[model samples]
Target: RHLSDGYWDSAARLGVHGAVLQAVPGGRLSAPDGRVAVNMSSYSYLGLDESPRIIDAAIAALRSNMVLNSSLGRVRMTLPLLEEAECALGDLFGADVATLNSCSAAAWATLPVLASGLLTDGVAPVMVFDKRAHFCMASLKSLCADETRVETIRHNDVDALADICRKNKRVAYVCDSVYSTGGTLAPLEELFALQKEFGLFLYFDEAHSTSVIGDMGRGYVLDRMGAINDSTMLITSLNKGFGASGGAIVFGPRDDDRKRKIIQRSSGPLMWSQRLNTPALGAIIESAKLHRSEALPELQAKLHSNIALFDGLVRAAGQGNSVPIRYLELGSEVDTLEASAYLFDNGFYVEPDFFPIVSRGAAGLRARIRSSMSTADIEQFAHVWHKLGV
Candidate 1:
């Protein structure tokens, strides 16, 4: 019934008992009859789901009657928080312009349009993405499939990417500088160099990359490629490291007209819906200020340190033999899920990955070790993994 019966059923059938899927009672399945469950899945990478400041911001915005909608007021009633948030993000990612939306909205609105090659032709555009990009990118690629062409290069394979982008003039190279699922860095330097040589417009989906890599949570693109201001377009999500809701898309090297073209010709598959709420927007604005003022770096250091500690534990027990757990460089897709579920059942909330969302047969658990977790919690998780023959 309830308590993630589907997850439990699928996991148990695979000889793994616990899963994070819980069906709402009366809506889909029966409620759990007061039994223990495990949380081996989540996307709250920075533990912001429990963050007090973020919570307080949400509460304050809600209490102030700022929970109004864009349509309810004139679009001129646009929240200052939205602009502030974008300004902060632009600085962080080193971009010339920034726009905010939900991660879904940002992708649905921005990705297809850019990939549409409007500036070049206003027609079906070609998108070159990594073989292991996130689901949203794949969705954008597919949604435009009848008109636009989509090419997936092998995961993190820069040489292959070069081959694909070289001849395609109106191509948009879509990539995740730091792929969240694998906790791996894409060869950004290689890709950028190739983009230069091949004249490919670079569209970076730094959803997982922001605050996970690069200087002070700025992401891997600028850190690795350098001087991307006006050279690339970036789309980032703030729910993870920034611990805020909504998404952002930043453009580089744009004059007012080009910027106008990008924004003016917006499509509805993404924008013609409820915009991000005022409270969420306020929180995002506050979070952006926090980031510029040092919260981003502080949080990043804590996460890195925690990851190091966890990796040591895994290494001590002889697991994560793939890469290094500190960098999320370990384990296969199925193994990651198995180990993640096992750990969750025992008492740890971790995340794992799989295909289509990733490339087929290239999934893995993304153990974004949280800074807020105590040493004891980390040890307990390690102990559980050890017991699983890690």
Candidate 2:
């Protein structure tokens, strides 16, 4: 509070806190002030967000007399498209799946069950999280504040988690498959290893990793580990890589029914939340079909190729290689805002990370690469970066 004389003071000083954006049909975007920029802020990892196939499917769904609202009801009141979407999603993950409005809703619904001693024998599971876990997972504290014990360990340090799990009877280790801000992937193999050693249950938020990593985009964790047993659960976002707008809970092969039943019976969001709309349901179904077919390999390859190109460009400029998500540590909010403004002035857009999102000293520009971007686009960004001298 001391840093600001009023609430908007710091934001006013920065001038890049949040800009109202108007998006055009085919991935182009414009700032409210009418400055146009190519979107590097989206997580359309597969570049399918505006695909004609998805758009066509959505139109077909709308024309099929599909209701706009889910009647504002629960899971029992289902629609054909909803069932079709869930079936396709289950098939994609090779597990039983349930769909909801968004990944945050799915997480909000499921976390209470995991934290309330419902998953264990009247012993509330100790919840351990990666320090950089998504806000959706971290928000579980409000729901089970009294029922569960929660703690956070350093990012991807399984040893720290193991040490905490040793003293607890049951533990739930929660993390994202890919950290959204920096695009750093979780150490899935090591986490699974810890699960075996400590009997820990794992929960992965696959918002950024689903349909973007692994074979057929099953996800980075399952792609690396092959299969999951009863101790693992995956929550995926249909909005990101799938070019749709919903979320799914993909249960492991074993105890899938039990897990499903628990959430169905008790989770507030699942029991009373709205279901996926017609267009989203249709889009997901089509996306899943494509995801499992031969077409997916080409999309996946293109994404990986773009990632490699971006990494190479960064490396050639003396920066080390990173995943598709890249960061440049600018050290202060002022520095980050200035860098982003420089890019914005040159008709480019990037996400700026500052205090609260990341530590103040770690403030930086969080840049991402998409398969849809041309080589010229990458060259343009690199040139801009070099000019900025960051």
Candidate 3:
């Protein structure tokens, strides 16, 4: 009775929480219940999710008898494809790389150990988080709450970050290059300057910026910083812009082998969990190869163009500009859901950010732009926004 009551209570109040059965066809999905919509909810920023080349590579990998399951047990067990995947990622990030199942997994595997009170100078490193960091990065509080001196500062407040870092002799700063929810970018230049002054270790999550941000898609943080420093580490999501699946933990250029060895020895998932399936691995390998190819520049150009157009349109509508993802706040949860439903009715599928994704007062519409979105699509969306007058 309790279970039934609880389920029913939440079910009755569901809005954005309800899942729809959808058939994905290119950049659009058709729900079984009836709606056909362009997928602005997806993180396929480069339109690579629908790429024929990536699909063909995956199919070829399947035909080549790439394992459906990696029964090999853990990141240490090196299959040939996995080795190649790591190498591809290494080349992409321009650092030593290790593969994992997802960005969350990579974080879970790395953070606790990195924060386990270990540092080069034998000081227990303090873990400082940005207030607006991704949930995965922020979750370090639970994972290593007692393991280290974990603290948080106001979002992108360099002065606050510096204040925290100044108190600790050694520190590890956790934040994202691009905050995913509101599409705001971190001030990497200022943060790195703090790193220089304070000699702090930085853990930058490139989950939302990789394959879409830097030169050949290294990352926006890396692009702005111009080079990798010894004090930084990068965690990337392969599924987003790469149009593949899995995660990579890349070690910035560092002479010290102890950090890498310690991570290997202490990471539970790296030592115990199964490797990502071979088909996805192969797809990622191909994806990484394409990332280095000439086609990448063209793809990036198109995506940037789309981002610029979408950002301008949002600004024209008196909304703030955050290229690639534009947050159009519609006030309450009900209002945001209503706006999303309106977009769905017009064949658009944008995500409604609420509660856990954002704070209570910050619920809104998250309209994402991709390389494949045509100018006509942008025009229509802009027109719809004006007509709705939200």
lDDT of candidate 2 vs native?
0.76
- Which prediction has more favorable lDDT, 1 or 3? 3
* Model 3 poorest 10 in a row by lDDT: 3-12
RMSD (CA, Å), candidate 1 to true, equals: 6.0
Cα distance off (Å), candidate 2, residue 159: 1.9
- Give the per-residue lDDT digits (tens) of candidate 2, residues 1-390: 343233234544555555577876534577767777776657787888878888788778767945675433443677777778788887888888988899998898888888887766567888887888888888776676667887878888878887887888889888898876655778877788778887788999988888778789898888887877788888988888778888988866733588888888994898887887888888888888889988788887877777777777664211343345777777877777788778877877776777666665787777766667777777777788788775
At residue 383, candidate 2 shows an lDDT of: 83
Give residue 164's lDDT in candidate 1 (0 to 100): 66
Relative to the unseen true structure, what is the C-alpha lDDT of residue 358 in candidate 3, on a scale of 0 to 100? Answer: 59
The full ranking of all candidates by lDDT, starting with the best, is 2, 3, 1
Better of 1 and 2 by lDDT: 2
Better of 1 and 2 by TM-score: 2
Model 3 segments more than 4 A misplaced: 1-17, 71-76, 119-121, 254-258, 316-322
Model 3 residue 169 distance off true place after TM-score fit, in angstroms: 1.5
